Amino acid sequence: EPVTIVLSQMGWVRSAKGHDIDAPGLNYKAGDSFKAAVKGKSNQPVVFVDSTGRSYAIDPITLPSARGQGEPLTGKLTLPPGATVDHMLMESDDQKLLMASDAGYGFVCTFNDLVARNRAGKALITLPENAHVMPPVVIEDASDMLLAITQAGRMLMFPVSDLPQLSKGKGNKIINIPSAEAARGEDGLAQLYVLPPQSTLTIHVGKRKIKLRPEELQKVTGERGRRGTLMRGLQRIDRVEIDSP
């Protein structure tokens, strides 16, 4: 059966039947509210990634219905002190994924690599000083390009296949960001995409729009782990529109 697992802001979860659920409009306890939702199947394990970079797996069947307030994840999971669950995933066991930190390090892995039954989960991705976990990216096509944009406004593109595949760890650097700067929030991974090579991006920066055609994206293609290319007026991105045939 198709289900929609809902996570509240205070770390409460519940399993709603179907995918027509209005999660934000659900009933949350006082002071609590919607945080995230994920759509999957009842036979599919739901994966949780906490703020420290650990992954956990829970069988949806064991979760309470969305008819109640739900239950605290602490009931089934033991997270590091002060940690919170920031990401949920439900994909096929073989589904290729892109894990990364905002320090510019990351690796390609499989959904199965995140599945940790034990309540303490597993150390999936290691975070450098003051680094944060990036939103994991689902790799639809093994031939897609990896696109990275830094806070400083630098871009780098290369086949996602170039990024070494790991089951855990800090990973290798996607784009070159000075470790010292990253640890001070002076620079870092601002955006991370995996998309077809003939894609067109429309980037919203304040009251301006920067349109990058496949031709422009070509000029920023290079080797994994490089600087790489500095863009004009591409800091403080508000929104990114991606057109991919």
Binding site: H204, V205, K207, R208, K209, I210, K211, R232, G233, Q235
Partner: protein, 154 residues
């Protein structure tokens, strides 16, 4: 003993003078009267590093007025004399502006724009760029707030 602060103060006074360094109102009045917005205002947020580049890039059209609908301007053009000899008008959204297309060869501290097969435009990076005013004024605030903090330490 300690001329580090005295030297830093001078450095702050240096940049402050350069940023606030001199140096149009008519275009503003025309903008609201056309129901449009100055391109310079749309580009007031660009960094100190990119401001010179973008200002140079656009050429004289840097002084352009952006309106969502050019037909708003027509009725006003006839008899219009209270304006610069060249008045640029670009149709676009002042909240989400699409940049103009430029065939450009960027040099160091300058750009070479190909306007046509028989016409080039050489626009060097200007001191006191038109664009990036907002970011420029902010930087001046930081410098002031920093200069006073240096003065107590002096």
């Amino acid at each position: 003993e300690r001329d580090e602060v005295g030297a830093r103060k001078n450095a702050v006074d240096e940049e402050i003078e350069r940023l606030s360094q001199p140096g149009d109102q008519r275009l503003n009045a025309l903008a609201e009267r056309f129901g449009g917005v100055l391109l310079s205002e749309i580009y007031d947020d660009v960094s100190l590093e990119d401001a010179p580049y973008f200002s140079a890039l656009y050429g004289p059209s840097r002084h352009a007025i952006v309106v969502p609908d050019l037909s708003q301007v027509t009725e006003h053009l006839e008899g219009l004399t209270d304006c610069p000899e060249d008045l640029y008008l670009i149709e676009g959204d002042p909240q989400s502006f699409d940049d103009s297309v430029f065939s450009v060869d960027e040099l160091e501290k300058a750009v070479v724009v190909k306007i046509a097969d028989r016409q080039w435009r050489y626009s060097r990076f200007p001191e006191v760029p038109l664009f990036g005013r907002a970011a420029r004024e902010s930087r001046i605030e930081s410098l002031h707030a920093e200069r006073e903090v240096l003065s107590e330490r002096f």
